């Protein structure tokens, strides 16, 4: 009830078999998949660099908007300050012009009063 086959007897040891109850790969496709992964990584890098470039362009846009606001503020300050300065000059000199015109008119009236005294002196 234990049949064994005696095998491979030698000085190092023995061996035997006891029995109790009887009874293509392609390198180019490996390189294709490794290159495909590398190409997929490269696509991801580009999308990031693109996304980063859009962010750099937004930073440029923001800085440009700051520049535009500061320059318009200057230009609107310059032109409003000039405008009211010229108006103030027109007004101040118009008042003094009218004042001197009214003042010279009195002077003429005085000369007429004198002329009438002269005419009456011929009596």
């Amino acid at each position: 009830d234990m049949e064994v086959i005696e095998l491979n007897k030698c000085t190092s040891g023995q061996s035997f078999e006891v029995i109790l109850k009887p009874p293509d790969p392609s390198l180019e496709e490996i390189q294709k998949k490794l290159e495909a992964a590398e190409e997929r990584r490269k696509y991801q890098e580009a999308e990031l660099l693109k996304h980063l470039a859009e962010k750099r362009e937004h930073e440029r846009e923001v800085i440009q908007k700051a520049i535009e606001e500061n320059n318009n503020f200057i230009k609107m300050a310059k032109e409003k300050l000039a405008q009211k300065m010229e108006s103030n000059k027109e007004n101040r000199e118009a008042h003094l012009a009218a004042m001197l015109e009214r003042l010279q008119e009195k002077d003429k009236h005085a000369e007429e009063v004198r002329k009438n005294k002269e005419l009456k002196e011929e009596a």
Partner: protein, 433 residues
Amino acid sequence: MRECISIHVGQAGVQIGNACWELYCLEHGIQPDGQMPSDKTIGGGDDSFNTFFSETGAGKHVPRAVFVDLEPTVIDEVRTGTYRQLFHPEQLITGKEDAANNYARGHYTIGKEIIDLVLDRIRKLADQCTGLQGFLVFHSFGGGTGSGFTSLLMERLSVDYGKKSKLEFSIYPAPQVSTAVVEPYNSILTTHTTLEHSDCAFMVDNEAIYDICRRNLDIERPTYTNLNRLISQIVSSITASLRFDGALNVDLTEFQTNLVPYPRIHFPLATYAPVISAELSVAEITNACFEPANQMVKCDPRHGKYMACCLLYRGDVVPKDVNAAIATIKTKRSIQFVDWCPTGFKVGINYQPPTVVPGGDLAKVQRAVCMLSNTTAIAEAWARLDHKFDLMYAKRAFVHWYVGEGMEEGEFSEAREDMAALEKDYEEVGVDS
């Protein structure tokens, strides 16, 4: 680098300027020679005090300031002062006739006679600067020069120097020490024009400093120099963070960013503690800064909400003492903040002890603080001003003095209309969300 140019305009601006610079010379130890024995870098160097002082070859430290008045009696005194040799004679500019309490004369008629000269010297000062921070403009609100020329200067500064930081230290009209009756006109007028060109305007009202000198220094009738000496301490506290190496700092831009919630709402009041006669605590001086009695403007903070508070300490004070005091303050139901400002405090500390002019009535103290608070309550000061303006403009009183110098009544109308909007804006920023 990081230099700031001070421009003092009119009697109030000049006399306060010479008060501040004397205090500066005392703090940094600059002698009336212009010499400073505590500076080793001759004619050059980038120490912190150099923000406000330039260095000349022979060792003289010259102030980065410009004094302009349309009339010389006040400025001549500076030229004859004990500190004459500190300024290059050109830094002091003076016309022959003043603006005669008339905004139109200071801004138009008389102002245009020296405005360019003033702007030229400001450019040379800016040329001496490796990294210009901005400008400090000291002026009154009710004088011809203080209102008219300041507004023309601020407009020109915005054209020449763009949106570069322009800050004001302004004296608000006070009937007690008021000296002209057209002051409500001049104040409303300059506010209208410098509104768009100013980044921030630290306000003080001469009657409040007066009452403070009376109550705290037992001076029966305080002198203008007294008032000026206190203001110098306030200004020094505002500038100490830029003239002294300090653990915590607040620069011109930090002041702007934290104290101005909206473009038009840029008028924080000042407060300073403690004011002690010649003959303490850290939490005490902070608590004093919120008491309505000790407010540099006739304003009741309990009638409004705090939008921002800048607490600037100098002396024997360390940040843990402050945060504690701010913590105790944060509990106080008497101090209410707008619900759109959850973080409501900015703090700067400079360990350099305070200093007073020797012999003055102000006692030397070891710690001090100045608080700049933007609160909606300051609308009351605008209201009292506008009302006086209404009383005269309804009858058009005195308007002819401004019309004779080229001004149109439409300017008065739009200036008051804008002031009324400022009142309405101060009201609306206080409504809760």
